[PDB]
Amino acid sequence: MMTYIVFILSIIFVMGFVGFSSKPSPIYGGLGLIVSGGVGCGIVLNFGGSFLGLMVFLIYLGGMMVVFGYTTAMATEQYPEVWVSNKVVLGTFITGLLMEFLMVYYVLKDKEVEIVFKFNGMGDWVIYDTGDSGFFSEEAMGIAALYSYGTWLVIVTGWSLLIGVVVIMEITRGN
Amino acid sequence: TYKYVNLREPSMDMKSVTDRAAQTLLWTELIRGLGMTLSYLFREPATINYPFEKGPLSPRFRGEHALRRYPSGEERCIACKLCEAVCPAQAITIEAEPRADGSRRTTRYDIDMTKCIYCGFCQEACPVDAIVEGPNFEFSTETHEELLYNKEKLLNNGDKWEAEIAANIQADYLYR
Amino acid sequence: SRGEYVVAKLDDLINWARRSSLWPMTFGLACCAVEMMHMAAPRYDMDRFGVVFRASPRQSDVMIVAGTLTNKMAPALRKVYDQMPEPRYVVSMGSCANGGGYYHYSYSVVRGCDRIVPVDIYVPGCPPTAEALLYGILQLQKKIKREKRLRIWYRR
Amino acid sequence: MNLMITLLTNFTLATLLVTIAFWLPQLNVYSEKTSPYECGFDPMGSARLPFSMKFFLVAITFLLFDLEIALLLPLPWASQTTNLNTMLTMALLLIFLLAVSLAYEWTQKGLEWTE
Amino acid sequence: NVWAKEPVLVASFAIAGLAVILPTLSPYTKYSLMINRATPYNYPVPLRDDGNMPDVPSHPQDPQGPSLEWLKRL
Amino acid sequence: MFMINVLTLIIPILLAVAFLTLVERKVLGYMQFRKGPNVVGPYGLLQPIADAIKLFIKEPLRPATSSISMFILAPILALTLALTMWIPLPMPYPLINMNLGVLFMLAMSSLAVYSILWSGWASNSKYALIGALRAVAQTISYEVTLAIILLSVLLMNGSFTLSTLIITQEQVWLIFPAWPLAMMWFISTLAETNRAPFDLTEGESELVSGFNVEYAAGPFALFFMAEYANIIMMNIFTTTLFLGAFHNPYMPELYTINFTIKSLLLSITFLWIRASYPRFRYDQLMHLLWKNFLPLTLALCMWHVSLPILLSSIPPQT
Amino acid sequence: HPAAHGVLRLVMELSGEMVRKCDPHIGLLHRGTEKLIEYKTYLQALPYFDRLDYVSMMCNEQAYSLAVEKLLNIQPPPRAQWIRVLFGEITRLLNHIMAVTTHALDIGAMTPFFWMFEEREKMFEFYERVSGARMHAAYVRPGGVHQDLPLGLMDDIYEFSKNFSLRIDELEEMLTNNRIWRNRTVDIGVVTAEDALNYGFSGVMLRGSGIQWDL
Amino acid sequence: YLRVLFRANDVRVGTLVGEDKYGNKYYEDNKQFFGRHRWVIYTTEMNGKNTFWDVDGSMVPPEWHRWLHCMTDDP
Amino acid sequence: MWFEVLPGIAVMGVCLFIPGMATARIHRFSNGGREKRVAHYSYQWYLMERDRRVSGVNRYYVSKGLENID
Ligand code: SF4
Ligand code: SF4
């Protein structure tokens, strides 16, 4: 019956992520953010990527954990804001969800949406793999090239991460 | 004479330092602690089984605040108020009248089981051993009204057993 | 009479279920608290009866007021007692709590803890024994056998 | 979407637990139970009060070493290549750099304050 | 001595250092190389008839070509 | 019938948790020289049933500063995710043969952490705040070392799939090629499980159970059942991961017997560890974790890199 | 709260999990013993010294009866003195074992609680058979021990002595080079001797830090 | 056996000391420790309370109450 | 000793003995007595897909062996 399920997961992703981006208190922001991260992991897992989405969900999660620790630490009100608490946040949430449902309407019941490109509005079973003989689940080797051919790239990556560590240490020390 | 503690030092022999390292690694005496606990595990436990196997007591235990009487005789109390005069929270209310013969008695002999503290001083003070601590300790009352004993409550409480109290005093009169 | 029959069976079920666990909390002012700790002694187990310590005021069933309730304590006592779910029960444990007792004629001492909270079960003795306190909890379980709440609700 | 089927069934399980918690058993007499408890004293203001933290380096340290976990996780698929010595060289360089970062902030007492 | 101030660190540096040193000397490294080259996911393609190349055989049973044999030979 | 299989996974978790609470109380009683639940019928059983029923009676209540959506949607995420960990568990052939399960274990355990955190936040009574921040502390400490030890233990033989993992657990147990790594892994998972005050600082006597100090009496069943699912969960994951069982081809019941007995003996071992050690300490948890585990773990990681590259023992990671 | 041993208001004005101030607001257990002992007599107000302390149930009685007898110029006969010494040591044993026990409860450590409270149940059996009291033996009048120990009791004390020596060796077996409890508590509560004098500490503190003093 | 089975826990009949008016039974074992010497078995319908269940303390007569709290050694 | 805890352990062990047993019994019931064919990779997926193609029912587990040789 349903077929657009990747697009529908994208719609849920954009709803939660716009309510994220409308800036309420970071508690509710993180709630909508982890909802968005989980359904984005579902998008990329259902699209063909095996582990990369579950990986990035884990990483992004741990980032949001530390972000929650610091928003408990520093930014607290006498009573923090929710989506339905203040005028401006409520207006932004309604208007963002309005633009979302309007795009849903122009994709579903119309032909073409031309805001920045002439996006072909139909279902995303196209384009897709036409049953090619993988036998090794392409993205696994596609990440496994990083230690085979990836000489210079992980050198500068680890070097910049080491510099990131000492940078955080010296900015905290510089009192 | 004194015996102080932690005069000790890490001995610097190689077998000593490698045994301290192996204890640092494997948490060996932590496993010894586990073994001690398992040695109490296979030990048989020591509880009682309450409604069926009650716990022990002593012959000198302090219970009920009941009253005795003579062999087929009068109420043994003679209203001498020594029990109130030693009663530390004054939970002994005594109003006395002589009866219709000329012999002396009471009217009202109330013990406040709330305000009582179960010294035994009214056991030690009663000149004829008329007020006695009972053996049993089961009062457990759903109201506040029904922990204020009147005289007839006390005497019906003391007629629920005497052979009990006679046995405990008969086995305990020489001591005190 | 199938309606009252089925309601009677279900009321017996839930009343058995209420008298089953009954975990209290530990308020425990003075030496009656030491007697509570010896009711947690292994010679008289409470965990034969599913009766567990639970220091939060938010999931205990009965509450044992055990000690000498003073004026500096008593509003905090009721402000613990109230934020506790609708089946709530009080065990007045000890001569201090069941009517004032040994500190009755003094300032700063609440003369009996009926002046703050209601009381289901008084257990006198200073201290109670472990045996007498256990007898009081058994009588409270028999009160929970005597509920007939849901029969009352149906016959209303 | 088989996992989505199972997630839907567990969410229905959770909602029936919510409804059997609130609606069914008995009533809900209010007016003091809603008060916040600490130990028997109504505290100042409320919570959501500015609460300083002890660790400053340890959370960002967690973040960066989680990112380096993310770099290290395709070690199983890497282990089957023709360029074996290069894989071994860059992998040892990654963990050696990671341990250099750890031991650097460990000798520069980054963790010897309010951990 | 230098050992049990923080000795799990000495244990870590020791087993790490032998993990660095140990791939210098081994009899199994080129075995790992030849195994990990000689096992393809992919397909051995044919090629044009030949200019009579004295290699690259015509039947897969023909032992002219480079096969794998040392597996069952330890 | 697929729905029937889902129901026969989510029904035994209820029975497992309730009768395991019975097991905890009675084993801990005979552990501590006293006696367990004995008066209630045959030995205990109907009283843990009564514990579940009694806790469903309790009629909970919402607090004041207690935003209802976050409040009643936190322990739902707790119980649901503590279930949905149990999808790729290879009780002999798992529910969904996913091509990877262990990073999924990591992510859903971290979701259990977040649900604990949001309950401790939106309870909004300052004690759940202190407890939630202590949970953040023991999550900062124990979602790195667990991950890299996992990378090491499946670096040797894994290839991320549990069926190939039970094939690799055939000649010798994987306890023996990695035993001290297994010691560190067991301690880290015992921390992450948030039982066992060997490494638990959430259910204090210094505070009163920092997750849900003042939550409500109703969803305590949700939280309680979620964490004991967490206990059985990581112990079953242990009993799959390191050691295992020679399964009969075309008969799985023997595999179920050996697997289940090993897993529940290690669960009794877990509770037996909880019985005997004191609580532990925030900054001492950081000190112990980092300055004891982490260099030794990295050394084991590089040594299990260098081992199959020097013994040609690389897996057939197809 | 259970870590607040008994009842103890503690206003801690902290910086977050690493403090700034602690304020021991006590007084919630205020009863009025001094006013009541003004309005009574000696023999009647003796159980306020039973009930003032509530673990050392006999030594504080010994203190009060010694105050009255040092006032009154009376030396009791020496069998009462040796029985008073005996119960002083037995009650001191009970108090130290509860101190170890409740510190174990505060720190975690759930089992030595149960072990040593079985031992303390034996102790309360001794008080039962001595005075007919579970926890508050008056039993020490000014004038000495009243209503002396009955026949067949020193057997029980002897058997308790042997078994308790074994049980306290088993407590040293359990804890005491436990790594986690040791390194849990090492460098907290340091007390210099100058401060130990002028802050008015006494007894176990002054034994426990520096000075060699014994009452 | 069903009665003693769902009574509380025990099967340890084999001493059979005495019985009393109200019908109740009193057993005393040698083999157990100090705390499980003696026990009681409550008979049913002693005041018609269906007292197979919900048994009380102080259903015991007082002479056996002194016996069962171990103040003497003989019934 | 442990004599009074083993019924709890046995009942809870059957509570962990059930789910894998019922799982594998359902999977053998769910394909006509054959095991549930897993599919890791694309190659084995296309092999199972031509399996469900050449059975006619579009149910793969029949697997029509040696009958349509001719
Ligand atoms: S001391 Fe005895 S005789 Fe005197 S008034 Fe009191 S009860 Fe009666
Ligand atoms: S035992 Fe009770 S009634 Fe008797 S003197 Fe003491 S407080 Fe008064």
Ligand code: SF4
């Ligand atoms: S009633 Fe007695 S034992 Fe209880 S608190 Fe008061 S003095 Fe202590």
